[PDB]
Write a protein that binds this ligand. Structure first.
Ligand SMILES: *C/C=C(C)/C=C/C=C(C)/C=C/C1=C(C)CCCC1(C)C
Ligand SMILES: [Cl-]
Length: 209
């Protein structure tokens, strides 16, 4: 099982999700889910073709992964913000916090020296602030909606919080960090997480609709 095989698997999974969401497509929600998995599909194909594998010191960094995350994770937060009924100002805070996490990870991965752990730490701090907004203010806000919408928000929120919290550990234990986990295992774990936090996320929304 090679890296390219794992990338192709993620590509196929994202593509199936993309077509499923487009078919089922309230247009805003369905269009967002197409963007979430559609962008990831492209990133995985590019990586499957061997494009964007950047050598850094003694590790290999996958640049398309971080461009993907920077564009798709704010769309996931946007989806959750619509469910919770955020005003346009609360959106700005959480999307700003999200972008800090994603940019810090991208920069830390691309830096060869130990300064990269300083960048990782900053993303960790901003992530804790993002979790606070999901579990607190956004949950208060979602409470004002129908019982079914509130229930859907809580289920997507917990899926999001629990799984997103695993990524920094995979990053740190993998090549970008202490380089303990091997690239193949590290990639396999992230392909699984990407698929669940995007396509699984999406199908839980379809089921409730
Ligand atoms: C579809 C892709 C998803 C949901 C990716 C999520 C990625 C994260 C939650 C990554 C978080 C990170 C930290 C909290 C600190 C810095 C390193 C990151 C980017 C792995
Ligand atoms: Cl990486």
């Amino acid at each position: 099982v090679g890296l390219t095989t794992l990338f192709w698997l993620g590509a196929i999974g994202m593509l199936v999700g993309t077509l499923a969401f487009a078919w089922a497509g309230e247009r805003r929600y369905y269009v967002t889910l197409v963007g979430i998995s559609g962008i990831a599909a492209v990133a995985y194909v590019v990586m499957a073709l061997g494009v964007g594998w950047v050598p850094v010191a003694e590790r290999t960094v996958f640049a398309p992964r971080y461009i993907d995350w920077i564009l798709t994770t704010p769309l996931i937060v946007y989806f959750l913000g619509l469910l919770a009924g955020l005003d346009s100002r609360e959106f700005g805070i959480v999307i700003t916090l999200n972008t800090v996490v994603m940019l810090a990870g991208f920069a830390g991965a691309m830096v060869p020296g130990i300064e990269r752990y300083a960048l990782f730490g900053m993303g960790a701090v901003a992530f804790l602030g993002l979790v606070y907004y999901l579990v607190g203010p956004m949950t208060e806000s979602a409470s004002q909606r129908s019982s079914g919408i509130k229930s859907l928000y809580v289920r997507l929120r917990n899926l999001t919080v629990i799984l997103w919290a695993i990524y920094p550990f995979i990053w740190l234990l993998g090549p970008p960090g202490v380089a303990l986990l091997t690239p193949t295992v590290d990639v396999a774990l992230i392909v699984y997480l990407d698929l669940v936090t995007k396509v699984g996320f999406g199908f839980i929304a379809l089921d409730a609709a």
